[PDB]
Every structure is written in structure tokens, then in C-alpha cells.
Design an enzyme around this catalytic site. Structure first.
Site, PDB file in Angstrom:
ATOM      1  N   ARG A   1       0.816  -1.221   0.000  1.00  0.00           N
ATOM      2  CA  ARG A   1       0.000   0.000   0.000  1.00  0.00           C
ATOM      3  C   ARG A   1       0.848   1.269   0.000  1.00  0.00           C
ATOM      4  NH1 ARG A   1      -2.063  -0.108   4.657  1.00  0.00           N
ATOM      5  NH2 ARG A   1      -3.207  -2.060   5.178  1.00  0.00           N
TER       6      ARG A   1
ATOM      7  N   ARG B   1       8.630   7.330  -2.023  1.00  0.00           N
ATOM      8  CA  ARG B   1       8.438   8.388  -3.027  1.00  0.00           C
ATOM      9  C   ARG B   1       9.749   9.055  -3.373  1.00  0.00           C
ATOM     10  NH1 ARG B   1       3.484  11.888  -0.496  1.00  0.00           N
ATOM     11  NH2 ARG B   1       1.859  10.294  -0.889  1.00  0.00           N
TER      12      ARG B   1
ATOM     13  N   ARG C   1      -7.934  -4.946  16.597  1.00  0.00           N
ATOM     14  CA  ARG C   1      -7.185  -4.095  17.490  1.00  0.00           C
ATOM     15  C   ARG C   1      -8.080  -3.039  18.013  1.00  0.00           C
ATOM     16  NH1 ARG C   1      -1.735  -4.281  19.336  1.00  0.00           N
ATOM     17  NH2 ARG C   1      -2.651  -6.395  19.571  1.00  0.00           N
TER      18      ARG C   1
ATOM     19  N   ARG D   1       1.343   7.244  18.417  1.00  0.00           N
ATOM     20  CA  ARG D   1       1.380   8.619  17.977  1.00  0.00           C
ATOM     21  C   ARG D   1       0.684   9.602  18.895  1.00  0.00           C
ATOM     22  NH1 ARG D   1      -2.634   8.145  12.685  1.00  0.00           N
ATOM     23  NH2 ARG D   1      -4.476   8.053  14.117  1.00  0.00           N
TER      24      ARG D   1
ATOM     25  N   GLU E   1      -2.015   7.939  21.671  1.00  0.00           N
ATOM     26  CA  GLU E   1      -2.839   6.776  21.217  1.00  0.00           C
ATOM     27  C   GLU E   1      -2.126   5.481  21.427  1.00  0.00           C
ATOM     28  OE1 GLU E   1      -4.261   7.632  17.157  1.00  0.00           O
ATOM     29  OE2 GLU E   1      -4.921   9.656  17.963  1.00  0.00           O
TER      30      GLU E   1
ATOM     31  N   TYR F   1     -12.117  -3.045   6.938  1.00  0.00           N
ATOM     32  CA  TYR F   1     -11.736  -1.645   7.223  1.00  0.00           C
ATOM     33  C   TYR F   1     -12.268  -0.806   5.997  1.00  0.00           C
ATOM     34  CZ  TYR F   1      -9.563   2.749   7.873  1.00  0.00           C
ATOM     35  OH  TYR F   1      -9.379   4.091   8.118  1.00  0.00           O
TER      36      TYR F   1
ATOM     37  N   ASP G   1     -12.796   3.193   4.364  1.00  0.00           N
ATOM     38  CA  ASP G   1     -12.683   4.640   4.496  1.00  0.00           C
ATOM     39  C   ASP G   1     -14.090   5.246   4.358  1.00  0.00           C
ATOM     40  OD1 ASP G   1      -9.721   4.949   4.802  1.00  0.00           O
ATOM     41  OD2 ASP G   1      -9.757   4.468   2.582  1.00  0.00           O
TER      42      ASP G   1
END
Ligand code: FAD
Ligand code: FAD
Ligand code: FMN
Ligand code: FMN
Ligand code: FMN
Ligand code: FMN
Lengths: 383, 381
Positions: free
Chosen positions: A173, A177, A249, A279, A300, A348, A350
Site C-alpha cells: 500500500r 516516493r 485491534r 502517535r 494513542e 476496514y 474509508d
């Protein structure tokens, strides 16, 4: 003929399905067991600071689907917002996802794009024909140093498993770059609703044909009072978890308030396994058009979802999929119910994907009425 | 009653004034001594690579003026774009403008915003009471290491002067962003026109009442054949340079073609004085919705603007301003002429400011007809 429709959940899936059916004459009853609409996209302001908090995690809208983009623009004012993630590891602060700036900073170089391709091809092990694990995918494409700095400890924290035991597909995924673009998402449309997602979902839910009852758990007895039920709660829960719980999770969000700017950006990753939170989020940075002196922040933490925790990320390995297959063979036997959404289908999804699937599900149902065909239990594949 | 308008220049100043008036009936003659429209905003496609090249250097549109935004959106499709500049110095690549990332990277720290304020306050050279130069002001603000890495060298190249030679008032604020924001421009609206500024100005210029002649110089003798003249060419030249030439920097662009991504961003600054170009620009990066295999780039060299050079950046220090004051007091006695634009008024003006001042200028002229009042020579201060 107007049909009576029960919809379990007032997140995007229920709300969008309800809205499309409402607009065609059907009587839609939307219930949710929480005391507010919005599902896991819910946001609300913090009393003291007035910061708009994304209660169940930062939610950044992103899509290539213009139909979906126009749809939400009918229900909110979308503000331009480009998610730019930072990370702290090894006593430095880096830009993610891995880009030409991350490369040059990490190895102390001033490579051009083509020099950085050559430096990374040299670190990578191109002797691995087809990486099968997350670990092998990292060794193949980014090299040991990058892998152990940015990915190994971070992934172990998120998944609670060694990366040599996770599929390659997670990192597939995320290519390296070889330019200075550090936008986190590549999607053509990206933004944040000016008055938040709760308000957006409120506008979606705002129709004469929709009644919305909160604090109201679904009850298997109700089904008979409706022509069709759309269910976006957990699949295993609807069956009383009779075969066991689908593995997720969960996340703990530890709140703190700071007077000023705690980190200077919305999202800071902590790549070291020796830092216990994954994070820190600083939620005021998700609404940069507003000014706030006080700041709500969250540390988190990731862990295995237990019976009374909220399920966030579905694990979906062999064991979990064998458990899913059992609930699916119960599901295939049902009439006049459709399971939808992240909880209803153990995927999952979006926000834009959830929306597009909700539009399709409504459409399927409407088409089934005019063709007098039976409505299937799932409008998406899960084999 | 229909006026004969002469407008000197086919850049944004003249195009926009010209269209505002053509649409209320007046006959508008636009001229430009160059061979194309657009003034310094002009762009065009390179032959070999087909990259849209910003011929007089990169032009990024940005504004907080929504009236101006809506206006150009009538003449172009604005694509989103956010300028983010990188800089190479001391064997490292940094983010500019200086921000919390630049600072953490530079000093090898993981400071939070407030720890970083504490860090810069200590580095700041506090023995300097009452700074008088750009050098002293930078030194007091951020200390020697940051000053010499990011300011001293680049100032020498950009201005052709040492920061000790320039006033402390040139930078009034501590120049560090104590957050991770590296958007070069803070404006609400930012973007790039999908088909280029030249097509945008070509569309502003497309009206029946507008005649455009190119390769055409202004000649004073012309004035008598028109009712009003709008003048966007240089104020000092209009008056024969009789008191001297207003000081500008000029830029040389040295073109090369690379097959691939030469540098991986639109704009790379080189802070070191030992690197002779100011920046390298890679123009395909100004059109990210487009894909190009061949890439057109420019090393940019800054020098004093001499008589045959295109003027770019106005120096506007003590002497230049005293000099400007002399041409201003000549212009104040003109009639039937208004001086506009970066060149007519000796100001650095953004595209959006230039368009807003042009709309206001046409309006003041429209209003002056209907009210029977004389048009002023300048429509700003
Ligand atoms: C940590 C995290 C971060 C995310 N970040 C992003 C992001 O940045 N961008 C993005 O596009 N997407 C993001 N997502 C995805 C996003 O949250 C989902 O797309 C969206 O929430 C799916 O909506 P849904 O309505 O299908 O399910 P949900 O929002 O989960 O809502 C289902 C509703 O059903 C109700 N319910 C369940 N069972 C019952 C019951 N038995 N009786 C009555 N009510 C019931 C629940 O209370 C809930 O309100 C993220 C998801 C997670 C977990
Ligand atoms: C290096 C540089 C970078 C810039 N970058 C940006 C940017 O990123 N974003 C932004 O918004 N702005 C930028 N600008 C500002 C932008 O270029 C100006 O806003 C714009 O050029 C103003 O247009 P104008 O019509 O007033 O003047 P000009 O574009 O300069 O047009 C004046 C025209 O008048 C003509 N003319 C002059 N004298 C005569 C005469 N004797 N006879 C006939 N014709 C004459 C000229 O040929 C020219 O075509 C930049 C400017 C410079 C110098
Ligand atoms: C078990 C698990 C499954 C996940 N599945 C997905 C997924 O299918 N799609 C996705 O975008 N993110 C998924 N994520 C999260 C991303 O991989 C991502 O890195 C994570 O949400 C934290 O970073 P992010 O919000 O920037 O994406 C999953 C995370 C975990 C822990
Ligand atoms: C390295 C560097 C050098 C700059 N030098 C100057 C300068 O010499 N003169 C100037 O007016 N702006 C200079 N700027 C631009 C300033 O940052 C200024 O804040 C801003 O760009 C002013 O324009 P605005 O109207 O869009 O806010 C420089 C910026 C950078 C990054
Ligand atoms: C006149 C002037 C000269 C400048 N020269 C430099 C410079 O040599 N190097 C640099 O890094 N920044 C330089 N800057 C940029 C300052 O950081 C600039 O104001 C900064 O971008 C302000 O950022 P802001 O947009 O947060 O206000 C200059 C700015 C101005 C106005
Ligand atoms: C003498 C001089 C004056 C300048 N004045 C401005 C200005 O008023 N506004 C601006 O945005 N940039 C101005 N610039 C350009 C800024 O320095 C800055 O660099 C701009 O953002 C990029 O131009 P540059 O990097 O070529 O210098 C000026 C540059 C110089 C050399």
C-alpha cells in the site's frame, strides 16, 4: 408502495442508506445504541478549549470518487486540508511517508530523485522474488535501515505481531516516493468539513421520512415490524458471538490539554517500539481555519480488542477469516436483512468507500422492489 | 459617450483595466512592445518537452481577496497548488520558510514549539541592543549559525549587497515558524490556472471593444489621439530617465532539459554564496495534474539590472525611494494619464494585488466620467 425500513446505526452507512430511501417515499427508522449520531466519525467540541475533537480517531476525508465528493459537498462545506504526517525516531523528526526529504535527512545526503533511486535499490534486496511478509517487503524495497527505523517497531506496536508474521500487503500500500511531495494521501479530493462530521451526518439524516432514535439497542424481535432491515452493527454481535469474537485491534486515547501549541502539527508518529504510544494527535491542527490557544491532544495506544473495548482495526488473518466464514454461513440463510459497513462486514472502510457502498446498497434495494426480486444479505463480496 | 483609451502594456494591469472599460462601451487600444501578451506573467509550452514554462520565472497565484479569486475563475480553471520550497545548504536539504522542521533538522533536536522558542531565544545574540542593520537584526533574532546558513549567503546573491548594508527594518519579525507549516504562502486561495496565465489573459483580453497591437512601442506623440492613457510601463522611462534609473535586480535564466525528475520539486533554493545561482526551478512541478517525461529546468542568476535587462525586483532602499519621489512629483502635474502596476509605480505587486488595483482603477475612471471629475494620476498612494 412505501416500505417500512429499520436501519441499525446512525453512522455513515445507516445515514446514507436511510437518506436515499427516505427520498423515495419509504418510512425509515434509524436506531443507534449510542446517545449521539455519527458512528465512529463523530466529532464534538471540548468544553474548555472549544477544540473540535475527532472522538474515535482523526478522520481525514479523501477520495477519487467525484460522485461521492459532490454528495458530501451537498451536506457540508469542505475545507481544503492536506494531511502531512511527521515522525519522531532516533532523536530526529522526519517527514512521512518516506520521500526524498526523508531519504536525504536519514542518510545525510543531497540526492536528486535518480541518485536516491540508486541508493535505495542498493539497500534493497532484489534477490527476493515475491515478498510474502511485511518484513520481506521492507527488506526488498526500502532496506534494513529504513525498515528498522520507520516501520519495524511501529508496525509491531499497531499489530501486536512480528512483521515477519504479517502479510506483505500492508506495506505494498505504501511505496517509497522519490520526490519532495509529502502529502500523506494521493487522492484527487481531500478535505475536512467546516462544521465537523456530526453536522454533516445530521444534514444527511435531515429528512421528513426519517425518524432517529438514540440510546436504543437493536432487538431481534423488532424485525417483523419492517419490510427490510439494514444492519451496520457487528456481524458477530448480531449472532450473540456464538462462535467467538472477530479479532480487532482497539485504541486507547489518553487526553491531555496544553496551553499553546503542543507539537505544531495534527499528527506525530513515534516510530520506536520503546515509545509506548503509536502517535500523538493535536486536534486543532485538523481545523486550521480556526484559532485556539488551549489545545486538546491524545496519546494513542494500540492493543488487542477485548470484550468491552471499541473495535477499530479488523485483524483479518487466517483464524479471523475462519471465524468470519461461520457467521457468513448463518448470514446467507436470512431474509429481509442486509449487513453493511465496517462492523457489519468485518472490513476496514474509508469514509468515501462506506458512502459509495451505501449509495449502491440503496440502489440495489430500490431496484429489487421494482423488479420484484429478493434483496440479498450482502451487496459486496466477502469470500 | 465613448472614450478612446490607450493602455500601455498587455499584462494584468492593462488587460484588466482594458476589459472593465471595454464592457462599458469605450474603445480600448492596448499596445505592448513585446511580441506576446501577458507581461511578466506570460507562459508558454516548451517545444521538446511540452512543459508549460513560466517564462519570466515562476508565478504562483495566491490571495485572500475572494472577489479577485472569483474574477480569475471566470477566465481560467484554477487548479489547487501549494508552493513548498526546499533549500540545499551545508550538505543538507531543508524546508523553507524556516519552521519547526528546519530547526529540529538544523540543530538535530526533537523540540516542541515552545522548547524551540526557548532554543532560539538562547541562540539570539542578546548583546546587540538597538540593531541598525539587517545583519544585526537577524543576529539578535536567531543567532550566528542560522543567520549564516540561511540568510547571509542568500542575501548577498539576491540583493547584491551584504546584510550589514541593509536596514534592520527590512525584517520586523523573528523569522521562525514554530510549527510544522511549510506552505510558503498563507493566503486562503492558492492555485495555478489549468491552461496557463497567457490563456487566462487572452480570455480577459477577448472583447469586441479591445484591439491589441504587439511589437508596438509607446511614443509620447500618441497621447493627443486619446481621451485617457493608462500606463503600466516604467515611470522613470516615461520621463526619459531624466533623473536616473530606478534600481532593480534582474534575473538570468539558464535553461536545461532533463529526461526524468531532475530535482523532485518546483523550487530548490541554494543558500550558499559559493553556489552562483539563487535557485533551480523545475517547471513541470507547477502543473502536477500533467505528466511529462522530459523536464525543463532553470538555474536562476541574480544581478544588478543594467540598461538592456528586464527589471525584476525593485530595490526600494533610501536612494531609490528619493529618486522615485522626483518622478512622482513630475507625474503629479500630468493630465489624462494614470500610472499603474509594478513598473508604473515602482512597487513589487502580486498578481492578485495587481488585479484588485486594476479593477479599482477602471472603476475610479468609470466613476469620474459619470461624475464629471478629473481622473487622478495615481489610484493608490
Ligand atoms: C481509528 C480509525 C481511523 C479512521 N480514519 C479514517 C480517515 O482518516 N478517513 C476515512 O475516510 N475513514 C477513516 N476511518 C474509517 C471510518 O471510521 C469509517 O469509514 C466509518 O466510520 C464507517 O461508518 P459505518 O457507519 O459503516 O460504521 P460506524 O461508524 O462504525 O457506525 C455503526 C453504528 O452502529 C451502531 N450500532 C452498532 N451495533 C448496534 C446495535 N446492536 N444496536 C444499535 N446500534 C448499533 C454504532 O453505535 C454505530 O454508531 C477510520 C476508522 C478507524 C477505526
Ligand atoms: C521574478 C518575479 C516573480 C514573481 N512571482 C510572482 C508569483 O509567484 N505570484 C504572483 O502573484 N506574482 C508574482 N510576480 C508579480 C507579477 O509578475 C506581477 O504581478 C505582474 O507582472 C503585474 O502585471 P502588470 O501588467 O502590472 O505589469 P507587467 O507584467 O510587468 O506588464 C507591463 C507590460 O507593459 C509593457 N511595456 C512597458 N513599457 C512599454 C512601452 N514603452 N511601450 C509598450 N509597452 C510597454 C511590457 O512589455 C509588459 O508586457 C512576480 C514578479 C517577479 C518580477
Ligand atoms: C490491523 C490493522 C488493519 C488495518 N487495515 C487498514 C486498511 O485496510 N486500510 C487502511 O487504509 N488502513 C488500514 N490500517 C491502518 C493503516 O495501515 C495506517 O497506517 C494506520 O491507520 C495508522 O496510520 P494512518 O492513519 O496514517 O493510515 C490498518 C491498521 C491496523 C492496525
Ligand atoms: C529565503 C527567503 C528570502 C526572502 N527574501 C525576501 C526579500 O528579500 N524581500 C521580500 O520582500 N521578501 C522576501 N522573502 C519572502 C518573505 O518570506 C515574505 O514573508 C513574503 O513572501 C511576503 O509576501 P506576502 O504578501 O505574500 O505575505 C523571502 C523568503 C524566503 C524564503
Ligand atoms: C525582506 C526579507 C528578507 C528575507 N531574507 C531571507 C533570507 O535571506 N533567508 C531566509 O531564509 N528567509 C528570508 N526571509 C524570509 C522570512 O522567514 C519570512 O518573512 C518568513 O517567511 C515569514 O514567514 P511567514 O509567512 O510565517 O510570516 C526574508 C523575509 C523578508 C521580508
Ligand atoms: C530586492 C528584492 C525585493 C523583493 N521584494 C519582494 C516583495 O515585495 N514581495 C515578495 O513576495 N517577494 C519579494 N522578493 C522576492 C523574495 O525575496 C522571495 O525570494 C520570493 O518569495 C522569491 O524571490 P527570490 O527567491 O528570487 O528572491 C524580493 C526579492 C528581492 C531581491
Amino acid at each position: 408502495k412505501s416500505k417500512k425500513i429499520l436501519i441499525v446505526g446512525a453512522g455513515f452507512s445507516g445515514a446514507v442508506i436511510g437518506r436515499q430511501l427516505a427520498e423515495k417515499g419509504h418510512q425509515v427508522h434509524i436506531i443507534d445504541q449510542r446517545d449521539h449520531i455519527g458512528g465512529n466519525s463523530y466529532d464534538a467540541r471540548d468544553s474548555e478549549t472549544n477544540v473540535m475533537v475527532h472522538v474515535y480517531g482523526p478522520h481525514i476525508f479523501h477520495t477519487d470518487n467525484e460522485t461521492v465528493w459532490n454528495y458530501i459537498n451537498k451536506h457540508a462545506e469542505m475545507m481544503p486540508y492536506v494531511n502531512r504526517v511527521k515522525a519522531t525516531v532516533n532523536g530526529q523528526v522526519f517527514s512521512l511517508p518516506i520521500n526524498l526529504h526523508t531519504i536525504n535527512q536519514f542518510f545525510s545526503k543531497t540526492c536528486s530523485p535518480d541518485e536516491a533511486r540508486a541508493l535505495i535499490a542498493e539497500k534493497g534486496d532484489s534477490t527476493i522474488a515475491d515478498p510474502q511478509t511485511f518484513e520481506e517487503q521492507a527488506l526488498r524495497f526500502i532496506g534494513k535501515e529504513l525498515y528498522e527505523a520507520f516501520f519495524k517497531g511501529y508496525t509491531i506496536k499497531q499489530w501486536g505481531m512480528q512483521p515477519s508474521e504479517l502479510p506483505a500487503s500492508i506495506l505494498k500500500r505504501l511505496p517509497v516516493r522519490f520526490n519532495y511531495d509529502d502529502n500523506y494521501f494521493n487522492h484527487k479530493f481531500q478535505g475536512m468539513p467546516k462544521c465537523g462530521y456530526t453536522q454533516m451526518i445530521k444534514s444527511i439524516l435531515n429528512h421528513e421520512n426519517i425518524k432517529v432514535d438514540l440510546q436504543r439497542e437493536f432487538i431481534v424481535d423488532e424485525r417483523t415490524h419492517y419490510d427490510h432491515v439494514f444492519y451496520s452493527g457487528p456481524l458477530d454481535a448480531f449472532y450473540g458471538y456464538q462462535y467467538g469474537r472477530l479479532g480487532y485491534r482497539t485504541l486507547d486515547f489518553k487526553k491531555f490539554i496544553y496551553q499553546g501549541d503542543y507539537q505544531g502539527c495534527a499528527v506525530m508518529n513515534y516510530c520506536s517500539v520503546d515509545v509506548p504510544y503509536t502517535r500523538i494527535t493535536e486536534h486543532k491542527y485538523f481545523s486550521p481555519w480556526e484559532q485556539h490557544d488551549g489545545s486538546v491532544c491524545y496519546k494513542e495506544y494500540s492493543r488487542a480488542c477485548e470484550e468491552n473495548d471499541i473495535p477499530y482495526y479488523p485483524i483479518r488473518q487466517m483464524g479471523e477469516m475462519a471465524l468470519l466464514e461461520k457467521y457468513l454461513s448463518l448470514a446467507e440463510n436470512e431474509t429481509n436483512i442486509t449487513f453493511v459497513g465496517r462492523l457489519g462486514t468485518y472490513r476496514y472502510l474509508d469514509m468515501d468507500v462506506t458512502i459509495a457502498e451505501a449509495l449502491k446498497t440503496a440502489e440495489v434495494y430500490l431496484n429489487s422492489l421494482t423488479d420484484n426480486q429478493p434483496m440479498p444479505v450482502f451487496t459486496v463480496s466477502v469470500g
